[PDB]
A paper describes a structure:
Our data unambiguously demonstrate that the wider pilus is composed of the major pilin [name]. The diameter of the wide pilus is 70 Å and is roughly cylindrical. The region between the N-terminal α-helix and the C-terminal β-sheet, the so-called glycosylation loop, ranges in [name] from amino acids 55–77, with a two-turn α-helix comprising amino acids 61–67. The C-terminal region is an antiparallel four-stranded β-sheet with the last strand facing towards the N-terminus followed by a loop that ends on the β-sheet. A disulphide bond between Cys89, which is located in the second strand, and the penultimate amino acid Cys124, likely stabilises the C-terminus. [name] has no net charge but the filament displays a distinctive positively charged groove along the filament axis. In the wide ([name]) filament, each subunit (subunit A) interacts with the N-termini that project down from the next two subunits above (B and C) and from the subunits which are six and seven subunits above (G and H). [name] contains two intermolecular salt bridges—between Asp53 (subunit A) and Arg30 (subunit D), and between Glu48 (subunit A) and Arg28 (subunit E). The surface of our wide [name] filaments show a striking line of positively charged residues along the long axis, into which a double stranded DNA molecule can be fitted. In summary, we conclude that [name] has three known roles: it promotes pilus formation for both wide and narrow filaments, it comprises the main structure of the wide T4P, and it plays a role in natural transformation.
Type IV pili (T4P) are flexible extracellular protein filaments found on many bacteria. They form multifunctional fibres involved in twitching motility, adhesion, immune evasion, bacteriophage infection, virulence and colony formation. Pilins have a conserved N-terminal α-helix, with a 4–5 stranded antiparallel β-sheet at the C-terminus. The α-helix forms the core of the filament, while the globular β-sheet head domain is solvent exposed and subject to post-translational modification.
Residue numbers in the entry:
A (entry chain L), B (entry chain A), C (entry chain E), D (entry chain B), E (entry chain F), F (entry chain C), ...: 1 to 125
Write the structure that this text describes.
């Protein structure tokens, strides 16, 4: 067991420790988008359930939570823009996500061009 | 269980969440037309019942409701234009519908070219 | 139970609601003519009953009503034109009827070319 | 086959059931007068037949019935007032008729101003 | 086939189940009036048939039934008020109808202001 | 257009089909009596015409038919009982009538207590 | 889009497929009664038309069909019991109906206690 | 609201639309016979009125119309065959009737075996 | 959340998307027959209304439309074959229906063996 | 394949397992309301079928089941409050539903303010 | 990067590969029931369409397929037991399903106690 | 920490990197089919919505998009073959899918034998 | 090859053997949570499958295992707290995990504050 | 630099060369199990993909390889036992592994008691 | 301490210095393959992340680096051959490695027969 | 044994004692880098474990140690710069190492240009 045989093993550990460790930040961004997309997909369901009861759409979040929807997820900024009798607009996004996600009845849940680092969209596209 | 196998599953969920969610706003428009058509179809019946009693047609809605007709539905703007001894004209429409629906004795319950976003028709075609 | 199966059912209800509802205004016009023809047919009888008593025909309606004839029907404009010792002429019509109906002893109760929308005939044909 | 098509048919039956049914009470009054006039016309004949036999007129009804005259009709109040050698007076009337009918030789069978609801005339005009 | 696509279908079924189901109670009221009007119209005929036989009108119902008239209909309170030699008065009404219907010879079969919930009229107008 | 709206329409048709159809058998009985009364009234006339020619009354029917009287009507049993020089007796009745009708010169054409279901009267009352 | 979200959607489809599908067999029974009642109502009319021509009622069906009546409907057992000069009795019923329907002139078209599964009534009540 | 519930409702409407619609052509034939019988009954009256004036019967129709008789009805072929001093023969029939109707003084107004589709009878039976 | 759990969910969506989507073309065919049957049922009514006015049946469609009948429906080929004084024949059919529907007074509105893909029937059966 | 690459995959599975699993309890509540609404909609139909037979409404459930209605569904408390000759009131609700559903003829099938956790309504609004 | 760090990663992959892979066979059973329920639900519709045409129910499957129904699905044993004029019985089941599904008009499409591993039910419950 | 212990760890990473990485291309093909099936399923809905408005089917895509349908998905070649008044044919497929998918009203959305690498089908099977 | 060169190699092996060996106990805790989360996620699925069959939720585990669920995993304490008709509560945890995991329908599968070293939660939060 | 200082260094190299060299054969066994588990996990996926296409499971391996699955790995004996329409059984194992691994849909991929030195299992547990 | 004892120690150092020094070049080759395999394994992940965003695969490397991928490693020649919408091919290799490594979606990351001393492969196998 | 033979042996020991003793300080520097790289590699793991629990990254070291991470190694200056919700930066270095080592999620554990003799980096590159 030489020093050179130990020294080359130390050299390879430095190489393997760099390359084999994956990009963590990028992997979480897409998982964070799934949380935003899932919560908006759930939000659309409980909007339709409130439409059965009251014949309208909710401006406030507490109305949707009372019917059955969960509380806002960790590091997520859910915010309903507006809700008329026969329409709605719900913007939501994760802090370390990719982009903001809108949610309307005609277009469904989709993603906008605005970044999560930038400010919240005033109205959905 | 790799990261790539998880990553592609996250990618497919984003695709399925977009395409499988149907157009909600469009689906409700036709259901809203059925509510307007049904209420006008009911309104025509209670107009004929008032014709049996009083030998005339009602200008006011409260006369039709007293005989048996239900109250005006949620997000519906029912409004009788005019009602002579031997005729009537009743316009009605949903706020998030397609178009206004007229209701006369000779033509029955039919739909007009005027949109629900536009103002109420003054007289039926 | 799909959305398309519900959507086609909504489409067929719109078709059935248009075609199966009959022409109400036209149906009442002929029933209104029967009321005018019946009242003139009754008016001819009580004219003959007054002829038994007084040996003449009545100019006024109150004389015919005193013998037994009913009051003028709802939305009907009965009006005796003239009544000599050995003749009479009685025009009558419904507001939402087809045409005016005359009533003389020689021709009986018949219908004239003048429309109910137009003014009352001065004398019977 | 709609409910509205059935409902309007029910409405027209109510109209036709009112107007087409004639005045029954008035129609019978004139037929009842014919029964009184016929019985008095027959009574005058059998008075002349008794004049051939006895050279006088009958006070009692049974004398006229013995010669051939029929019994008093149903709901008729026949009553001979007086009968001298060369004259007679016979009042008669139906209960649901118009007026009392007299019967003398000089004037024949005629009708008086006294109503059938009012009491019987003591002597003929 | 999403949950939201099923959920909106459940929402529309709730709307269609409310509006498309017509007013049953009101529809039967007018049909019940036709039964009362028809039975009184039949009762008037068999009163005239008894007038041919007996020269009077019937106080009891069993006399009219013996000639040919049907038994009293289900949930109908037929009742002859009075019947003189030359007149009659017959009140009748359905339990779940609109109003009581009278029947005299001079006025025919007509409807009175008294309601079926209220007590039976003592005499016809 | 619901199933319940169709089902109630089927229910009302069953009610209207029962009540509005009149008693046919009873209506024909009185018309059949008019045929018997008319034929006996005609038979009395041609008996008087034979009295002008032969100075007697006919026992056989063929003698009356030769003068001008029509043949016996359908479902009618005309039969002359007896005919002396200065009198006659003629019984007649319809198979589906009410009662047998006699016909003598002194009493005219009248109806007897014997029913048409029962056997023919041997002699008139 | 989870498996549990798909699995619950499959569970609700099984529930909706059971409850929303109406009772078809029961719905047709009442429609089948309308066919029997309508055909008997038509049969009564053409019996009266044959009475105008021949002065009797038809035993055979071919006589009624020659005048204008339609052929026997599908899955209906029409059968005239008897037909005298002044009466008739016509039993008819659908194979998958409720009960047999009689048809006489005095009682009109009515339904009997005998079931369609049981044998045909020999004579009407 | 299922498709099957709508589909069975469409099936029942097809059944009810066939059976409930009565035979129109046959119903009019008997009404057309009444028009021919009425016009011949009127023609017989004005023949007797001409007999009072001229001591004969009319060959031409214009003579009867001048006295008071109406013009020939729509779709009716009135035609007087012959008219001697003390007799007459008048054939008449509707185009869509049953048979030709004769009219003589001895037999009155009666119907012949010749059909309306076949040619006009040369002389009355 | 595995790939296999996502993959089986994709497999079930393909199965549910095939089986749950109903036959649309077949469902519309019967609704299209109702439109043709309803329009012919309406056409028969306005033919009878023209018969009241003119004492004949219409060859042209514009005469029926002037009285009150609606315009020809979308994708429907209405065409009156012939119309004599006392009869008519009206063929009609939808482009994507089942068969052509005839309409005569004696047989009512019925369906023929000729298919809508095949040419129009020259005359009704 | 590092431990950190496995560890982050375990972290994302925990996130996806929380968010993607939908609210099951809320989804079933609306499906349970459809079962109650469907059963009451069916109950209203068989109430009208009993009205055809007996001319009344059923207090007991076994009468409705004998006509054709299904047995009470699983975890549903159907209960008829009252049923007069011309009216009815039927309360029903699911154990894990939203609210109780009433069912009257005038208002149809509707939902009340009373919760399914709370006790059954004594009478419908 | 040690061997122990690789060895524990291999150990966790074995654990995750067992637990995260769901029960595939059970998931397909319920999807297979949906295919059987959907095909029977479709089969019930085309049975009603054949009832409109032929006034009966089909014993053979080829008759239902000719109207519009699809071919039998993969690994499904559809088989109509019997079909009278006013009823039917249709058993069907998937090879890897749960139980056999019946289909009658009165009970609708329901599931029986017989297993798919066991033989086909001879008649529906 | 030997070189051989590092060397075997490098050897196992090469094995795990090959086997644990799943088939990505195959996984996307089935997800791409879901996008095509979903878009055709949506296309069928908006074809029925255009049928409600215009009483026909659309040849152009822009008509369906104006009603509410989304734009064509990424790497998808949607193309309507033909659209008559009462039918349609819509072929669609993904570039990296499995096969082309047709969409007609009678057969619904189904997959054809033609591959996505091969050219587009001219007409649907 | 000196002793000092061997001695420093022995010194570095002691350093590398300490630092490079990862925390095994902590790595397994999160993998153990995945086993508990996966088994509860599977348990929720088979609870919904039992809800399809029996219309309730299971108290016992053997009912869920009979449907298809696997046996309880090694070193896992699965235990269903309660299961009403329309709800359930299932606590589960690994012996060397982090915390207990609950599982209800409304909240899904989530983790509680109670530690695995501490006793089992009596009811879920 | 003594001989004893060199001699002890030679002695320590002999000790370090024995202890520091790990068990290679045992380390590969678990890596070989991962290859078998991964290939069976992949085999289960492509079995579900063939189920989408053909509605069955594959007996032959070439069918799975054609869809996308890789060739059999080096020193691995993959072998499908049986594959019915709704099930499968796939045994596989490495030559220098631990035990044979089965793969069914209900149990997933699991390991059996049979050793790789022993013969292949005939059927999976 | 002799010269011979020193001389033999010098002789053994020459032997130990030859044999104990391992093959360095060969040890690095396999570590260099791990760097290429790791970078391609990372490259495959960021290709799937670009597929989520743009619905395609990247031809240029800068697109993958912008998403999160690291810069090309030292002495590594990464080069994307081609990238269509639904596929890709990425060759990469180390200068002192063994062979070139390809990377496609269907086959994953694998090694080719071409040596690193030889030129770069034009397309992947 | 001469003095010169001893003297040359003393001379060679001085030469061998200089050359054969390796560079100790340099050998430890690379081993010290492995300790820093290993501790940062461990620190990255327990940062991801805290992200599972709290949905954030730790600023303090005591939070990471509580989860399972070891205490700071001897002669190592670990120090977390900052830690937002979705990112972190951790600098660490040995006193007798080469350079400071950073540790972020996107770049992994890498080495910076700053020397260990120089002061600690304020933020990672």
């Amino acid at each position: 067991f030489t020093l050179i045989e130990l020294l080359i093993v130390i050299a390879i550990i430095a190489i393997l420790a760099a390359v084999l460790i994956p990009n963590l930040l990028a992997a979480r961004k897409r998982a964070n988008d799934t949380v935003v997309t899932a919560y908006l997909n759930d939000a659309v369901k409980f909007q339709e359930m409130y439409q059965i009861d009251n014949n309208s759409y909710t401006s406030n979040q507490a109305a949707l939570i009372s019917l059955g929807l969960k509380s806002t997820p960790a590091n997520v900024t859910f915010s309903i823009v507006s809700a008329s009798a026969n329409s709605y607009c719900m913007i939501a996004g994760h802090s370390g996500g990719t982009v903001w996600f809108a949610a309307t009845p005609d277009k469904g849940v989709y993603k906008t061009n605005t970044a999560v680092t930038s400010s919240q969209p005033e109205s959905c596209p």
